[PDB]
Every structure is written in C-alpha cells, then in structure tokens.
C-alpha cells in the first residue's frame, strides 16, 4: 500500500507493498530506490529487527506505518603494509579502493604524505589510478612501503 522507510541519514523513502509480502521483497524495492543491496539492509520496527523469512502482517504492519533502516558494516578487509626496517602498519580497505586512497589512508593513520609514498606489491610499483583488486590484492596480503 504505502509505508515509510526511515534512514539514519534522515531520508524517508515511501514504498508500495502488500501486507503478506516478505521482508526480502521490500529490501529489493529499497535497492531499486536507493541502490543499497539487501544483504546490507536491516529493517527495524518498534526497536525490533525484521527477519526476511517472515511477512509484514505478523509484525502488525499496516499502511502509513514507519520502519527504520540502518546499514550493516560488511565487506572490506585488512592489508598489511611493511617498511624495509620491518615496522608494520595495518589498513582497513576494500578491493575496489584505488592505490591513491590507500595512500590517503596511510597518511590518515601515520601522517606520511601520499606523494612521498612508494607502494610495491609482488614486485610491482603501484599506480594511483588503479585499484587493489586490479593488482589481485586480497585479505591480509602485505604491500611494501618505501619512502622517496
């Protein structure tokens, strides 16, 4: 009918459902409207997280009612970055991160300016425009940092 999904960001999405529809079907509708994948989504009604195998009628959900949506913190990984002395630094990243914002992360954590950093992985100097995924850099892999 018409419900309202409310996000922590403050946006209030308006949706078109039927009382016996699954929490799953909705997350798909929310994905269409906000791009957010269902696996990241958490529907909450009256301080109660809604399960996907259940239906709307059972949570006492009728038109003009308002559920809350907040997002799970999923994907991404950690990589290790070592200097030649042995000093280790850890970094929270995602495969789609470019080498540029990786250098940015190194600066946020350690102070070292991004254009003073040389990153190497598997013997290859790492170009700013490319992503970690492009260099097939996975979870817990180690990059080397040398300072110019």
């Amino acid at each position: 009918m018409q419900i309202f999904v409310k996000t922590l960001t403050g946006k209030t999405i308006t949706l078109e459902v039927e009382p016996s529809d699954t929490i799953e079907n909705v997350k798909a509708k929310i994905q269409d409207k906000e791009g957010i994948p269902p696996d990241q989504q958490r529907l909450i009604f009256a301080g109660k997280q809604l399960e996907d195998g259940r239906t709307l009628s059972d949570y006492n959900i009728q038109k003009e009612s308002t559920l809350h949506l907040v997002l799970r913190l999923r994907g991404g990984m950690q990589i290790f970055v070592k200097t030649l002395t042995g000093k280790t630094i850890t970094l929270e990243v995602e495969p789609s991160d470019t080498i540029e914002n990786v250098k940015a992360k190194i600066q946020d954590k350690e102070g070292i300016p991004p254009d003073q950093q040389r990153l190497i992985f598997a013997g290859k100097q790492l170009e700013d425009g490319r992503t970690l995924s492009d260099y097939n850099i996975q979870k817990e892999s180690t990059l080397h940092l040398v300072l110019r």
Binding site: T7, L8, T9, G10, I36, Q40, R42, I44, A46, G47, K48, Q49, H68, V70, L71, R72, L73, R74, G75, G76, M77, Q78, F80, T88, T90, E92, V93, E94, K139, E140, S141, T142
Partner: protein, 301 residues
C-alpha cells in the same frame, strides 16, 4: 590466573581471513566478563539443535578457557566455530567474509545455543519484544555534538516509546551508523555507567567492553577492573609473519589513557582535535560500534 598473561604481543584471539567480527566479539564478551558464562555451562536438552554440544564445548574448552589461562587462542579453533556457523547458515560467508557482529550473535545465540533473550522491550503498552541487542535510532540536529551513550539510549527509547519489561543483566547497544561512510556523530562518549531506572515501567549497569570499527576491521576495548586506568585494547591482526603462506599475530595492549579521556566532559572532548587524542583512545571515541553493559560486579558502593 592474572592480567599479565593476557597482555602483550601474540595475545588474544588470532585473526585469520576476515574474522575480526568474531574475534573481537568473543573477546569483548568473554575475556574478563562473566555475564554470559551460563551460556557455556548450560546442559544439553531436548529442545537443543544437533550442533549444540560440540559448539558449547568448542567455545568453552578450546576458546574461552585457553584465552583466560594462556591469553591466546589459535585461529584454527575460531575456524572450527565459523565452520559450524556456515553449517547452520549456508552461503552467507561465515568462512570467508567479514560480517556484522549482530549476525554472528544471532546465529550463535538464537539458533545454536538456545539462549534466553537478553532484552525484553515494551513499546507503549504493547506486548513485549525479544532481542539480544538494541539499536540506537533517532534524528540528530537538535542534539549535542558529542552525546553520551546514556543520552543516546534515552533519546532512542523515547523516539519509539520503549521500556524495559525487566532489568537486563547484559545490555549491548549499537551506535547510530549508516554504512562505512556515515556516522551520526564524529565522537560519542561511552558512559561508564548506565542508569536505566527511568526506562523500566514500574537500577544501575556498568560498561565492560566497547567493540569498535572504523570501516572494515573490528577491534576491542575491555574494562578489566573498576580502576579508571583498567582498559585493554585488542586487535586480532595487529601484525603478520610470513607472506601469503604467513599468518597473523594478535596483540593486547594497555590503554590507561582511555580512563583519562572518560574523566573529561563531552564538551571538552568536542573541542579537542581527534589528532590530538593520544594512544588508542581516538578509536574508542570515534569508531565505537557496540557498547556492552553488565550488572555491576567490578565497582563499589
């Protein structure tokens, strides 16, 4: 036993393959606290699922006990637990991907360990609702720049008119975040004590851990003593030995400085550049994901 066995390099739960969500929750829940110890001690019944016994025995004798006595647990043990989890909830990345502590807790506490809901909540004279943790949800603009967890709890409770049916012994609160790129507040003050008196239709709880994450990696803070300075920071993957065939090295470090930032007011923390927050305390105030509360055992009065 003691504290000195828990502290140092190669201490804590060893991380491996996006496991920080598991290692840090376990560390938060069992390294020093005892509020959920019954969960590990409760005998097998009719109602219990197939994997129950061996799950409980793995968790008790291969993880919690070695952690408490040696200060270290192998990633192989955690990996066995992730395998069980994947046996229960298939094709969900329990063996490969970093996930939400909420999902880990739900599978473990609802499906495998038949665990009594930690929270009973009533919304405006409705019938009570059961859960293992509470999500803070409200609008920001009117509110203060750095709120306390107290204030967040209050505001979230009023925003949806909630009350405790009975007082919890273990209260896990989720901070208001919206994916990687969004935090409602740049800093949040984790109250050392929670007064829930005005949230029960009809009185105290203490903070024993804080589970943190900046974007993708979970780490832990733990209050081991009533002393202001009695804080530890844990990281399941603080270092690595080897390369591709190598392995992670967890670390437990002391962070007394935290106790000092929590003596200051929120208004003082607000006027303070996060780059001038010393030690690991920054991560506490800025990256908090879950605050965990227990019935007071550590303190006096």
């Amino acid at each position: 036993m003691g504290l000195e066995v828990m502290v140092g390099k190669k201490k804590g739960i060893q991380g491996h393959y996006n496991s920080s969500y598991l290692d840090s929750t376990l560390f938060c829940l069992f390294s020093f606290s005892s509020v959920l110890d019954t969960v590990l001690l409760r005998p097998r019944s009719k109602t219990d699922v197939e994997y129950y016994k061996e799950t409980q025995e793995l968790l008790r004798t291969e993880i919690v006990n070695p952690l408490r006595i040696h200060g270290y647990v192998c990633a192989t043990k955690i990996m066995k637990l992730r395998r069980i989890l994947e046996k229960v909830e298939a094709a969900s990345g329990f063996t490969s991907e970093e996930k939400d502590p909420e999902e880990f807790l739900n599978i473990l506490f609802h499906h495998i360990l038949r665990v009594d809901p930690l929270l009973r909540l009533r919304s405006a004279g409705q019938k009570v609702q059961d859960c293992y943790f509470y999500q803070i949800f409200m609008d920001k603009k009117d509110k203060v720049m750095v709120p306390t967890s107290q204030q967040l709890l209050e505001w979230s409770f009023i925003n949806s008119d909630l009350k405790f049916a009975e007082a919890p012994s273990c209260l896990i609160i989720q901070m208001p975040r919206f994916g990687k790129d969004f935090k409602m507040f740049n800093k949040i003050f984790p109250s050392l004590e929670l007064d829930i008196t005005d949230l029960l239709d009809d009185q105290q709880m203490e903070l024993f851990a804080v589970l943190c994450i900046e974007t993708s990696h979970y780490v832990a803070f733990v209050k081991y003593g009533s002393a202001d300075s009695a804080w530890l920071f844990f990281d399941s993957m603080a270092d690595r030995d080897g390369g591709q065939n190598g392995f992670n090295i967890p670390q437990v470090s002391r962070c007394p400085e935290v106790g000092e930032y929590l003596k200051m007011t929120p208004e003082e923390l607000h006027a303070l550049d996060p780059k001038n927050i010393q030690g690991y305390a920054r991560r506490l105030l800025c990256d908090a994901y879950m605050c965990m509360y227990q019935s007071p055992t550590m303190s006096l009065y």
